[PDB]
Structures are given as C-alpha cells and as structure tokens.
Amino acid sequence: KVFGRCELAAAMKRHGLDNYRGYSLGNWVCAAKFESNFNTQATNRNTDGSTDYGVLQINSRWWCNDGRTPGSRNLCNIPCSALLSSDITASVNCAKKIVSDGNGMNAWVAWRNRCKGTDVQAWIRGCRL
Numbered sequence: 001k002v003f004g005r006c007e008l009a010a011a012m013k014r015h016g017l018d019n020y021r022g023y024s025l026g027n028w029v030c031a032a033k034f035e036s037n038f039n040t041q042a043t044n045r046n047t048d049g050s051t052d053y054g055v056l057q058i059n060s061r062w063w064c065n066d067g068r069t070p071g072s073r074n075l076c077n078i079p080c081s082a083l084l085s086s087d088i089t090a091s092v093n094c095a096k097k098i099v100s101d102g103n104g105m106n107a108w109v110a111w112r113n114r115c116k117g118t119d120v121q122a123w124i125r126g127c128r129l
Contacts, residue, residue, distance in 0.1 A: 001086035003038040003055070005029065006127035008088075013129055017093040022044035025129070026120030027111070028095075032056060033123070043085050044066070046092050054091045056108070057074035063094055 003011075009029050012018070016023040035057035036042030043121035046050045049067045050061035058068040076094035083091050098107050105111045 001040045003032075003040070005033070005038070005123070006129075008032060008038055008055075009124045009127050010129055011088055012092065015088065017092060017095070020096060021104065022028050023099070023105055024120065026123040027105060027115060029123040030115040030118070031105060031108045031111040031121050034114045035108060037098070039087065040086055051080070053080045055088060056083075056095050057110075058083055058091065058094055058098070063098065 009025055012028050013025055017028045032038055032055050034104050036051070036055045038055065040055050042054060042057060044048045044057065046052065046059070048061065050059050050072070051066060053064065053066075058064060058076070060066040060072055060080050060082075062073045063076045064083060065072055066080040066123050076097055078090055078094065083094065099105060101107065105116070
C-alpha cells in the first residue's frame with residue numbers, strides 16, 4: 001500500500017507514535033518518506049546480506065526474521081514479511097522497540113541525514129489530525 005502523507009500521519013498518530021520518546025509526528029512521517037516513499041512494500045538489500053522491510057525499512061539483522069540473514073536476532077519477534085502489510089501495526093510496534101534502544105531515531109539513516117534538525121512539522125501541515 002502506498003500511503004498518502006496525511007493518511008499515514010493519522011494512522012501513526014492513532015498508533016501512539018506522536019511524541020513517542022519525545023519525537024513528534026513530523027519526525028516519523030519524514031523518516032517514512034525518505035525510507036520507503038510511504039510504500040509498505042518497500043524492500044532493499046544491504047551489503048551485509050541483511051534486508052530492510054516496509055515503510056520504516058526495519059532491518060533483518062536485528063529486528064525481524066526473513067530466513068536468510070545468518071545470525072539475525074529477531075528482536076521484534078516477527079517474520080519480516082509482516083512489515084510489508086497495508087496495516088502498519090507491526091511496523092509501528094517494532095519501530096517503538098527500536099527507538100527505545102539507545103540511539104533513538106538515529107537508528108534510521110535517512111532520518112539522521114534528511115530529517116534530523118529540519119522543520120519536520122512541515123510533514124503534518126494541512127492534515128486533519
């Protein structure tokens with residue numbers, strides 16, 4: 001499913017991501033834009049052999065099981081294909097563990113590089129939330 005900017009903002013909100021660990025909604029929406037272009041079906045393989053899945057591009061080295069990443073840890077306890085669904089619930093629950101992990105949203109490279117220190121509020125402007 002390719003979400004609309006405001007549709008995604010609204011679902012993320014409803015899912016408890018707004019201000020989750022001090023990161024406002026605009027942060028989450030910006031990171032989703034840059035990680036997957038709002039497409040829940042986005043996948044990207046990494047040099048290490050791991051793969052990023054879904055709207056939030058969650059890595060199979062640590063967070064989910066895809067059956068082909070040796071030494072994966074499966075911290076979110078889910079198969080990686082669950083992260084590709086039209087329903088963002090598992091992506092969200094998993095992102096919440098990730099962000100609680102220590103480095104915050106810095107875990108997301110596009111967030112760090114394209115979102116961080118920018119006017120992220122722009123991302124939810126005009127939305128009915």
